[PDB]
Design a binder for this molecule. Structure first.
Ligand SMILES: Cc1nc(-c2ccccn2)nc(N2CCN(CCO)CC2)c1Cl
Ligand SMILES: [Co+2]
Ligand SMILES: [Co+2]
Ligand SMILES: [Co+2]
Ligand SMILES: [K+]
Length: 304
């Protein structure tokens, strides 16, 4: 394997972290290959769940808890902290909230959150590498509570970063918020990618194509598939009661990705930097409710 940039994995990984039996587990938690049979039973279906009030309460709770866990991770970002250490804090924070860390053993993913440094687009596996001053790093958190998953991510600065890093992260955040502003009943899922790419392109950035936003509720990833690039073939129209994510991955250079030998880590083929932000959204009548929003501060961590 020829690496695309300066990043390398730092092994060994500490042994898989257990989750006390008292915490309710998703179907895939105990599957030998971490396959989710409830998800697989809906593979290739484009029909979107309309959530009940019970479902909405469940989503509101789990998404609030997920935000709390992301905030825990935010507090730990500093030079010299390893991504495994962030993951350990995340793991314990989920457990403290009587939640299962959704990524853990999801299709055999070995950790409890994804840590995506610099050229890693998404699905970076927490390991022994200490964060370095100048790095940018995304932590993507998902929690499972009472049958419901809640999912968000933010990109962070490690110490002082360069102008390019600031522009990339700022622009990525803007793409997400411009797409969210457009969410309301009657809007086609395929429109969001038009908005996101318009803004990314205007700032000299490209939009990752291989990874998309997604339905989430009783399943971790489900209909609708939500591309972040222009002129996509996404199936569906937003309706009150739909829950899904928007999670644009944006790059300094080209949009092409490839995966490391670990089967997870997705990196820019050109080794330039990528950034991502993500919210879980509920479509209402005036627009939408940002379920994973901060409740106690106006802005994402990188501005604050
Ligand atoms: C966006 C996405 N993320 C993950 C993931 C996985 C591990 C940790 C964090 N995220 N998985 C996704 N999948 C994985 C397997 N799928 C079924 C095909 O085998 C599609 C949903 C998808 Cl579609
Ligand atoms: Co993912
Ligand atoms: Co996520
Ligand atoms: Co997501
Ligand atoms: K990154």
């Amino acid at each position: 394997y020829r690496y695309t940039g300066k990043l390398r994995p730092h092994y060994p990984l500490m042994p898989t972290r257990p989750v006390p039996s008292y915490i309710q587990r998703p179907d895939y938690a105990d599957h030998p290959l971490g396959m989710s049979e409830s998800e697989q039973a809906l593979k290739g279906t484009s029909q979107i769940k309309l959530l009940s009030s019970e479902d909405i309460e469940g989503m509101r709770l789990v998404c609030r808890l997920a935000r709390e866990v992301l905030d825990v991770a935010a507090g730990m970002i500093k030079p010299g902290v390893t991504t495994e250490e962030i993951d350990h804090a995340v793991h314990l924070a989920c457990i403290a909230r009587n939640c299962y860390p959704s990524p853990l053993n999801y299709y055999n993913f070995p950790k409890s959150c994804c840590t995506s440094v610099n050229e890693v687009i998404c699905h970076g596996i927490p390991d022994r590498r200490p964060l370095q001053e100048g790095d940018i790093v995304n932590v993507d958190i998902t929690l499972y509570r009472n049958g419901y998953h809640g999912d968000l991510n933010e990109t962070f600065f490690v110490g002082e970063v360069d102008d390019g890093a600031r522009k990339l992260v700022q622009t990525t955040y803007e793409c997400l918020m411009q797409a969210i502003d457009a969410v309301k009943p009657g809007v086609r899922y395929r429109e969001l990618g038009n908005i996101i790419q318009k803004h990314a392109q205007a700032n000299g950035f490209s939009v990752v194509r291989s990874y998309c936003g997604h339905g989430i509720h009783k399943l971790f990833h489900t209909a609708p598939n939500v591309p972040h690039y222009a002129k996509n073939k996404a199936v569906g129209v937003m309706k009150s009661g739909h829950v899904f994510t928007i999670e644009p991955m944006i790059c300094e250079g080209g949009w092409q990705d490839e995966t490391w030998p670990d089967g997870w880590t997705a990196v820019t083929r050109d080794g330039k930097r990528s950034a991502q932000f993500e919210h879980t959204l509920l479509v209402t009548d005036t627009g939408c409710e940002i379920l994973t929003r901060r409740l106690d501060s106006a802005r994402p961590h990188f501005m604050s």
